[PDB]
Amino acid sequence: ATGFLVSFMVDARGGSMRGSRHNGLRVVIPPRTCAAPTRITCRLVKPQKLSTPPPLAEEEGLASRIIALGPTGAQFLSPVIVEIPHFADRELVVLRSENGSVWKEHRGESYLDQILNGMDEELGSLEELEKKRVCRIITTDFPLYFVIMSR
């Protein structure tokens, strides 16, 4: 029942947390992935707030709000897992922006058992995620923004 509104503390003992407002929204920081106690923030921002919203091609569309994970710039020692819920011919693509001005594409499977570093957490099958409509972003660092789009 320990969920977060917008942030939570985590140290090298690792930790996993779900949005209390949004259960599907999940952050997993596996043991040994950050050097010290770190304050993780995860905020869902409306597109209308950016000065450079993700450029949109003809049949392209956003499938989630902008996702800001903090602190911006944070480097982890290995990768971290963030699961983002998204909304329902075309294809899911995660985009990220290091500083808010340029957007690029971001992109595991067998890595799962490894990157958890021994954590007793029951990650879903990629197929179960598709049914519930959640994206799994694996990253070793936080850019200013991540977003989910469909092309």
């Binding site: 977060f4 040994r32 050097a35 010290a36 602190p71």
Partner: protein
């Protein structure tokens, strides 16, 4: 006298028509100011209408006197009076509706302004809450930690009041019955959510800073202990057992703290623990 009634009735009718089509207005205020002006003007106009009621009642009284006296045109006269009464009632409604509209637009402008100032204030408090600044030494972190505590408190106190006030206000509008109550409610929800987020952001920032304080407090304590071991070494039976207890505590702190860090930082913690232990053994 009946002849006189007709003129009076025509006069009242014309006055009602004039107030309804030409004096009262449909204009829609663009802003709070505009609304206040329009409301102030409307209320005087409405006092005028209510005040005219005396004229109308008096006329009915005459139409009734002229009817009960058995005037030849008593049926004609009592009808005109019914028509006047009706038209007057129509004007009072139209005036009341207008009043209801202006109050709604006005109040809503106030609330919107007060909500906006508050949401902005919250947005500002959040930036202070997001600072990464961890502080270079123990005295610096002590400073940040103490400064942020004061900030968390001043913000909690002032903010909760302002939040409460906007909430009570929003509720009063809804309880009095407002045309925009569905929209006002979304505002309350949005505002209350931001507040909760701010209080959480404040809280994690505080936890971050407590942890940072602990790390610097440890290293500071290590330095003090080394000096205390050294002081005694250069130098009673009881003092050493006591310094010994202080050492045992430091040993416990080092292990607890270790679980939280990894790599370079965690080692620095272990190095300093052993350094202290080694120094301690030399003394014993």
């Amino acid at each position: 006298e009946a002849q006189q009634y007709y003129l009076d009735a025509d006069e009242a009718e014309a006055w009602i028509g004039e107030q309804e089509l030409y004096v009262i207005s449909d204009e829609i205020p663009k802003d709070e100011e505009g609304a206040i002006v329009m409301l102030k003007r409307h209320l005087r106009q409405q006092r005028a209408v209510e005040d005219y009621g005396r004229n109308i009642k008096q006329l009915a009284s005459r139409a009734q006197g002229l009817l009960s006296a058995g005037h030849p045109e008593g049926e004609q006269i009592i009808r005109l009076q019914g028509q006047v009464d009706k038209h007057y009632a129509g004007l009072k409604d139209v005036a009341e509706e207008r009043k209801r509209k202006l109050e709604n637009m006005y109040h809503l402008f106030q609330l919107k302004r007060e909500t906006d100032d508050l949401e902005q204030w919250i947005s500002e408090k959040e930036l202070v809450a997001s600072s990464p600044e961890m502080g270079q030494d123990f005295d610096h972190v002590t400073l940040l930690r103490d400064k942020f505590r004061d900030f968390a408190r001043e913000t909690g106190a002032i903010g909760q009041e302002r939040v409460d006030n906007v909430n009570a206000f929003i509720e009063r509008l809804i309880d009095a019955g407002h045309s925009e109550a569905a929209t006002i409610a979304e505002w309350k929800d949005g505002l209350n959510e931001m507040w909760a987020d701010l209080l959480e952001l404040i809280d994690t920032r505080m936890q971050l800073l407590a942890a940072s304080y602990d790390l610097h407090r440890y290293f500071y304590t290590g330095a003090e202990i080394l000096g205390l071991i050294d002081e005694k070494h250069r130098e009673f039976e009881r003092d050493v057992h006591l310094l010994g207890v202080q050492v045992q505590q430091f040993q416990d702190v080092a292990t607890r703290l270790q679980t939280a860090y990894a790599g370079e930082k965690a080692e620095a913690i272990q190095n300093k623990e052993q350094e202290v232990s080694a120094a301690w053994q030399a003394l014993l």
